[PDB]
Amino acid sequence: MRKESYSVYIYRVLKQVHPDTGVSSKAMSIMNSFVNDVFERIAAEASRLAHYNKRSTISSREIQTAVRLILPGELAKHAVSEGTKAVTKYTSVSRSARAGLQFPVGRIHRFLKQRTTSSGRVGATAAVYSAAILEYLTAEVLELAGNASKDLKVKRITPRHLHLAIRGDEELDTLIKAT
């Protein structure tokens, strides 16, 4: 799958979880690969699930099930909680600010329509749910990495900090190697 850019949104999530922390370009490129690789597993699983519906539809519940199949343990439970809340806020400014999210609902909606192999509609709530799940994982990976980088008395998240963040988390480590 072609690697889309989320850098600007990854940077906005970062300035929330660590307002004083920067992120190098190379660290930013690993984060983007992480988001892209997770998203493509979500899309592939949602396509397979959509075939078990009448008109092959991908809604917020086809993404929720895919998240439960891809994210292990607490990561799933926390991401499902953040995904439901985002869908509930969106259905109740821009589409993403409507869902309380920094990640791009509009772009991810397009990414879902083009990447998924199902024949039916891709609902907007599936875009909202997907963005909230990618944002949550991003915010979790950034919180751990920014924590690591201040342990080293440096103000920038580098590939070393990301790698320490993920290998210091059983769920995240499993998620990455499975992906």
Partner: protein, 269 residues
């Protein structure tokens, strides 16, 4: 426009470009600044066209004013114009019968108050204590200028117990050239400075002040616009307030004044 180059959507593609290709992109950046400079000249020419078309728009606006003020009566052609579009012969005839003529009613009451408050952006700036004041508005006009570059909006008020001014003026001075410090961001004319007008409030009627004497939310704070930096404590938020005040001016000038009766009826939503 993304001001942090590392956040550019295709940064990684750019970064991987061989040096000689990068240098071609640099040439395109340079050509793009020249292109924006010519777009700048286009906007100046559009501005001159708006000035030239004022004589034609003014006649239809002057006639609207006379109708609203009750200074002239509708013609037979004007009366045959449906008050609302998309109405059956039934509905229109029934609409006209719903209320008999009232010779005490002169002109069109609350015309500009209703038109302004039907616009979602301007409605949010009209407080309840502004309503009886805006009811004395007899006309809202706008005119543009070449040197200094910008436009004005004039609010014409009939004699009223709130203030003595007959006309309240709002003036916007605009910049039409790209910022030399950042040419690639130019997306058209930008507000340099907004100048309001001193309101001669009668005793006890200043709805812009309240005793907590502190500033109070009021439409008429439109006439005490926020200062630009040369006349200024917070800068990044004073400039946001200047943009909001400019956007409200544009809505009145570009949208409400040319189509006021469509906001009066509520046909523009």
């Amino acid at each position: 426009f993304q001001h942090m180059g590392l956040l550019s959507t295709n940064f990684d593609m750019i970064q991987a470009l061989p040096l000689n290709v990068k240098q071609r992109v640099c040439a395109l950046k340079n050509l793009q600044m020249k292109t924006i400079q010519i777009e700048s000249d286009f906007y100046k020419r559009v501005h001159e066209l708006e000035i030239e078309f004022e004589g034609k728009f003014k006649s239809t606006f002057d006639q609207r004013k006379a109708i609203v003020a009750g200074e002239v009566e509708p013609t037979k052609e004007q009366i045959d114009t449906p008050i609302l579009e998309g109405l059956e012969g039934d509905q229109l005839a029934e609409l006209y019968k719903a209320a008999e003529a009232d010779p005490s009613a002169k002109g069109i009451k609350d015309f500009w108050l209703t038109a302004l408050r039907t616009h979602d952006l301007v409605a949010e700036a009209i407080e309840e204590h502004d309503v009886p004041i805006l009811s004395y508005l007899t006309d809202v006009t706008t005119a543009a200028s070449k040197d200094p570059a910008g436009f004005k909006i004039e609010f014409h008020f009939a004699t009223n117990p709130y203030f003595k001014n007959q006309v309240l003026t709002k003036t916007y001075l605009l910049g039409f050239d790209p910022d030399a410090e950042a040419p690639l961001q130019f997306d058209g004319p930008h507000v340099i400075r907004a100048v309001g007008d001193t309101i001669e409030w009668e005793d006890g009627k200043n709805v812009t002040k309240k005793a907590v004497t502190v500033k109070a939310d009021s439409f008429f704070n439109f006439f005490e616009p926020p200062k630009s930096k040369d006349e200024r404590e917070d800068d990044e938020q004073a400039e946001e307030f200047l943009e909001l005040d400019y956007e409200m001016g544009q809505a009145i000038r570009d949208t409400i004044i040319p189509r006021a009766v469509l906001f009066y009826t509520g046909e523009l939503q």
